[PDB]
Design a protein around this ligand. Structure first.
Ligand code: MG
Ligand code: MG
Ligand code: MG
Length: 64
RNA sequence: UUAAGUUAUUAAGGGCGCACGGUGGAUGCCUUGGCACUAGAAGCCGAUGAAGGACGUUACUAACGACGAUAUGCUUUGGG
């Protein structure tokens, strides 16, 4: 997904980070209430956030 | 029939031999780990926060390895 992230503006990366952290929060609450059963979504969102923060840092290090 | 004399049978248990079991982990075979060296290289890191740790990170969860809230991992360049 790193290629897809790389085409987003910096603010959009920040917007996707927040919404991904919101989806991840919702998945954990579903899991704790025994309602998710689709447990592979948790790791997918987690690594997506990692990729989003990786690129944000990359560009914040190319600018400075 | 009696008298005199002689000598068995028993095995509660024991002994010896034999047969069949149990226990135990010697012995043989084996190696995942060691021991002693040879050759080439390297030896010491730290306020740009070390050595060593604590606590955490996996869908489930104790310990160990790995990793650090980007956590049982992220990007990239090559290999495969
Ligand atoms: Mg008897
Ligand atoms: Mg015996
Ligand atoms: Mg594990």
């Amino acid at each position: 997904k790193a290629k897809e992230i790389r085409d987003l503006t910096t603010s959009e990366i920040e917007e996707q980070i927040k919404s991904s952290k919101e989806e991840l929060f919702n998945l954990r609450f579903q899991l704790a209430t025994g309602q998710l059963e689709e447990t592979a979504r948790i790791r997918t969102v987690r690594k997506t956030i990692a990729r989003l923060k990786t690129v944000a840092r990359e560009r914040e290090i190319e600018q400075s």
